[PDB]
């Protein structure tokens, strides 16, 4: 498929979202409110990026 790079980009982003989630949960286990704030904030941005790339894919399906 032509837009197969969109499939790649998506998984790369989903991977970063997974790291940031791992760290956020690690930070919750460690009870590090400063690192909770830092990671949770950057996880919103990463997840929105992911959301945007998925919208683009749904477009091609149509």
């Amino acid at each position: 498929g032509a837009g197969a790079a969109l499939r790649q980009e998506i998984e790369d982003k989903q991977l970063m979202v997974n790291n940031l989630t791992d760290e956020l949960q690690d930070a919750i286990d460690e009870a590090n409110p400063a690192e909770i704030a830092n990671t949770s904030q950057q996880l919103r941005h990463a997840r929105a990026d992911l959301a945007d790339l998925q919208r683009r894919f749904a477009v091609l399906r149509n």
Binding site: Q8, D12, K13, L15, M16, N19, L20, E23, A34, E35, N38, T39, Q42, A46
Partner: protein
């Protein structure tokens, strides 16, 4: 050193550093199904130090 080919998939702003951590996955992640990743951290203070975390071995030899 590092003899592999990587593609940066993200970075995180670390606390108490203007140097963000780089998140890298194998260039062959998609072509060969490679799982391998590494995290790279430089220190603004300690000039020559470089901290890398490798997760997972590669499912291929290193290329030319």
């Amino acid at each position: 050193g590092d003899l592999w080919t990587w593609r940066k998939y993200g970075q995180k702003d670390i606390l108490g550093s203007r140097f963000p951590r780089g998140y890298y996955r194998c260039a062959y992640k998609f072509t060969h199904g490679c799982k391998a990743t590494k995290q790279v951290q430089r220190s603004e203070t300690d000039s020559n130090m470089l901290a890398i975390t490798y997760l997972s071995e590669h499912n291929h030899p290193r290329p030319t």
